Ligand SMILES: CO[C@H]1[C@H](O)[C@@H](O)[C@@H](O[C@H]2[C@H](O[C@@H]3CO[C@@H](O)[C@H](O)[C@H]3O)OC[C@@H](O)[C@@H]2O)O[C@@H]1C(=O)O
């Protein structure tokens with residue numbers, strides 16, 4: 064099983080990327096993670112219209128190239144984002160309309176693709192052209208007002224500018240098949256393919272949250288578009304709350320569709336997110352892997368034939384054959400957990416939540432009061448602290464998100480009453496566990 | 500009164516205070532909450548040694564008086580903090596020792612107490628004089644080196660400077676009766692009382708976290724000290740994670756002790772906390788009441804007529820007589836909840852967690868999309884966002900922490916299938932629920 068997202072994705076011929084912010088590239092903590100985990104890069108803002116053509120006819124690639132250079136220097140491909148869009152247009156363009164805007168759109172496409180010709184894997188040629196008003200129609204923007212054919216023109220222009228790049232139409236809220244927006248976009252791509260309009264891919268931003276939740280029918284959405292003869296890509300993935308199950312579900316949806324090229328999460332750490340408040344990424348503020356990271360990696364690596372327990376379950380240490388136990392079924396915060404003869408008792412029933420917590424009694428969380436070796440692993444009222452979140456590695460180890468240390472049975476102990484602590488991860492049987 | 504903390508505590512002859520930071524008195528959002536909820540104020544830094552006597556013999560009461568005046572003008576008494584302490588001493592004092600330091604200590608007490616003579620309800624005369632080494636002995640500091648009798652001298656000095664003030668010894672990690680530090684303090688206070696040393700109160704900072712968790716024996720500690728003939732006060736309360744149950748437990752511990760004068764939480768909003776990372780207070784950064792706030796208020800008002808349910812229970816609407824139900828027991832994120840004939844089924848069993856979530860199925864959370872009226876109330880993977888946290892008002896209403904809006908049966912509906920939304924609280928029967 065591969066150890067990093069990009070490499071794991073590559074095991075199925077796919078890529079796993081992120082959105083890079085040029086201004087954060089001087090931050091070693093940021094780049095260490097980004098360079099290690101992803102093999103695909105999208106400039107978060109540096110290749111947008113305002114950044115690449117600040118004044119009409121004056122193309123500026125300094126910012127975009129800072130991102131591009133970093134990507135290629137570190138073995139990553141690049142997704143160009145984005146050429147035609149109603150948002151983040153430079154002031155001079157916002158003042159345009161009609162034929163003048165139409166030609167500016169065409170000139171912009173030519174200038175940017177010309178500069179990056181032969182260097183970009185995919186280009187989000189047109190972004191967010193459909194409305195969220197429920198009509199399944201076009202967004203009313205200066206671009207749409209130039210004529211309904213603006214999108215088609217953008218793609219034809221792009222094909223000529225760089226016939227080597229995959230041309231994508233990118234949008235959000237087009238993941239749930241039942242949504243009018245999703246179907247409106249489907250009809251457009253269908254029409255394009257039927258009439259010969261150059262389009263090779265559809266990018267699903269995949270910004271999931273309680274307002275626009277992930278739905279299992281996303282797989283049918285991807286299949287529907289793939290059947291039109293275009294590749295599909297998850298371009299700006301982030302999930303409010305970073306549910307491990309939802310992240311794995313989205314990953315498995317892509318792995319289920321042969322035409323799904325790969326997945327790009329919109330950012331590196333939650334603190335780098337445009338929606339940091341939703342802690343929707345795979346790494347938290349201090350750059351540590353979250354429970355969701357492990358779920359995605361597991362999925363990319365093929366997962367397992369035996370689905371993980373749900374609604375509870377024991378945690379038995381392979382070394383002692385004993386289960387994680389809360390002394391005397393106590394509910395006192397600060398109570399250090401131990402290894403004890405497995406038996407049907409709530410004080411041995413642990414639930415691995417999508418947030419990455421290990422709950423017992425329903426409201427008590429496996430908790431670590433410290434980050435160094437020998438830290439006592441105990442129970443404490445659940446509140447979501449990083450010292451209450453864990454990653455269940457495929458090798459059977461259980462690592463604390465905040466500490467990066469493995470649950471360890473003191474002195475390799477195996478007898479009952481053996482205390483559980485944190486300690487540098489090894490491979491010892493006193494650090495491996497089985498979910499029953 | 501019973502709608503605010505101070506007023507609710509006053510019903511039992513107690514107070515509920517906070518630590519005030521003079522630098523935030525210009526913040527209306529800050530003062531709106533502070534002036535409304537508390538009837539006791541402790542200067543967070545303005546009455547410390549360094550602040551009141553910048554240079555030997557040269558007293559400055561500008562900052563202290565600003566906090567004192569604000570408190571009194573807004574109907575709050577004041578706890579003086581603090582007269583003798585090893586930490587944060589001014590440069591001129593840190594360089595003193597022996598008899599000279601002893602004299603400085605005595606001079607400082609006379610100057611500060613003389614200035615506030617008869618205006619201070621309680622004074623933390625001596626602060627944190629015991630060690631955390633586990634020996635139960637005195638902390639090794641410049642003060643302790645002047646002679647073991649410095650504490651007694653401090654109290655005798657204080658009593659003379661102002662006999663109208665209650666003189667307290669304040670410390671942290673003295674809440675758990677089994678801890679050696681607690682015993683050391685206990686033995687000293689007992690000795691003082693037997694020898695007539697003028698000590699009227701013992702302040703328990705009450706800083707609870709996974710490293711030094713709340714334990715039910717805290718009530719025993721308070722009761723044991725009270726039995727010595729000294730009042731007790733919870734002086735700097737904050738709880739890592741702000742568990743509703745722990746905050747209510749601490750509140751009830753004070754209400755259970757006749758000598759417990761009141762409770763002071765160490766700050767107004769989590770963003771104002773010296774430990775904001777532990778989100779240990781009763782209000783959020785945006786100033787919204789947290790789940791713990793309601794728990795504390797409810798406790799101060801005399802709890803309920805019957806001990807509230809614990810883990811897994813139905814939530815029945817008063818006006819409809821029907822239960823909060825997840826349509827067809829769906830587990831799909833985004834499923835809007837409804838009212839339905841009550842029956843024993845998991846899709847009707849809700850667990851109110853200490854963090855304020857309302858869980859179903861074990862890892863699904865009552866979730867509000869937006870924050871305005873009409874917002875759909877649904878289920879979504881649990882992650883702890885404020886839109887997944889709720890307050891159980893004694894009046895039977897359920898309010899969302901983020902929105903400040905009440906769970907509402909659409910259009911006062913009462914039939915099966917009536918959808919649930921958020922809406923300005925109205926005390927209506929379509930917004931009232933009972934847990935059975
Ligand atoms: C096989 O019996 C089950 C029924 O097929 C199943 O529909 C359910 O029926 C319950 C009924 O369920 C509610 C139906 O409306 C939904 O909107 C609501 O969310 C459901 O909770 O509630 C009344 C109860 O008497 C019915 O039996 O469950 C049946 C079962 O066997 O549990």
Ligand SMILES: CO[C@H]1[C@H](O)[C@@H](O)[C@@H](O[C@H]2[C@H](O[C@@H]3CO[C@@H](O)[C@H](O)[C@H]3O)OC[C@@H](O)[C@@H]2O)O[C@@H]1C(=O)O
Nearest residue numbers: 907908909910911912920922923924925927929930
């Ligand atoms: C006679 O006053 C009534 C108002 O005219 C009426 O609008 C309503 O106002 C309530 C408000 O009602 C909600 C309206 O939307 C529904 O979907 C929801 O279920 C209702 O609860 O709720 C907030 C409350 O502050 C307003 O006063 O009811 C008023 C009344 O007193 O009956």
Ligand SMILES: O[C@@H]1[C@@H](O)[C@H](O[C@@H]2CO[C@@H](O)[C@H](O)[C@H]2O)OC[C@H]1O
Nearest residue numbers: 082107108150151299329336337338
């Ligand atoms: O104020 C502007 C921001 O709102 C803008 O935000 C970007 C919007 O597009 C998203 O894809 C990006 O992640 C997000 O940063 O950035 C430019 C800034 O001036």
Ligand SMILES: O[C@@H]1[C@@H](O)[C@H](O)OC[C@H]1O
Nearest residue numbers: 388389390391392403410
């Ligand atoms: O917690 C342990 C319990 O699970 C076992 O049944 O009896 C011994 C206890 O210490």
Ligand SMILES: O[C@@H]1[C@@H](O)[C@H](O)OC[C@H]1O
Nearest residue numbers: 471472473474475486491
């Ligand atoms: O159990 C621990 C063991 O795994 C580690 O290797 O050495 C220290 C022990 O306490």
